[PDB]
Design a protein around this ligand. Structure first.
Ligand SMILES: Cc1ccc(C(=O)N2CCN(C(=O)NCc3cccs3)CC2)o1
Length: 121
């Protein structure tokens, strides 16, 4: 499996699966500061799955590792903002994180293998 570009379509399909998940609902758009007045006191770099998709679709990721960094920021921002480890929105983040890591591991492995094969000589 030595296609250096295959990660992009794989990431588009995994973002489609995440957008079908009810658990992604809170993570698909920005936080309204009228609903959460303190959100930006706590979170200095916001991130959501619409921004991740639009970055991928614009050709502004060079590797799946960069996409993976931004998706992990979505989840770390949820862990930082939550006032309880058993909040509804934080608990949704943890299930979605487990699904994302399960699916992204082959994408990263295949990309890194493909690049190694490219630089074999
Ligand atoms: C209470 C708590 C603990 C952890 C979080 C959290 O990670 N937030 C704040 C709330 N967020 C938000 O308002 N997203 C927009 C939408 C919500 C539902 C449909 S659109 C997402 C990010 O919030």
């Amino acid at each position: 499996s030595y296609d250096i570009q295959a990660w992009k379509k794989q990431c588009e399909e995994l973002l489609n699966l995440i957008f079908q998940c009810e658990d992604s609902e809170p993570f698909r758009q920005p936080v309204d500061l009228l609903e959460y007045p303190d959100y930006r006191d706590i979170i200095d770099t916001p991130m959501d799955f619409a921004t991740v998709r639009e970055t991928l679709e614009a050709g502004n990721y060079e590797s799946p590792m960069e996409l993976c960094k931004d998706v992990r920021l979505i989840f770390s921002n949820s862990k930082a903002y939550t006032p309880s480890k058993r909040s509804r929105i934080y608990s949704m983040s943890l299930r979605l994180s487990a699904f994302f890591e399960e699916h992204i591991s082959s994408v990263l492995s295949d990309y890194k293998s493909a690049l190694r094969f490219h630089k074999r000589n």
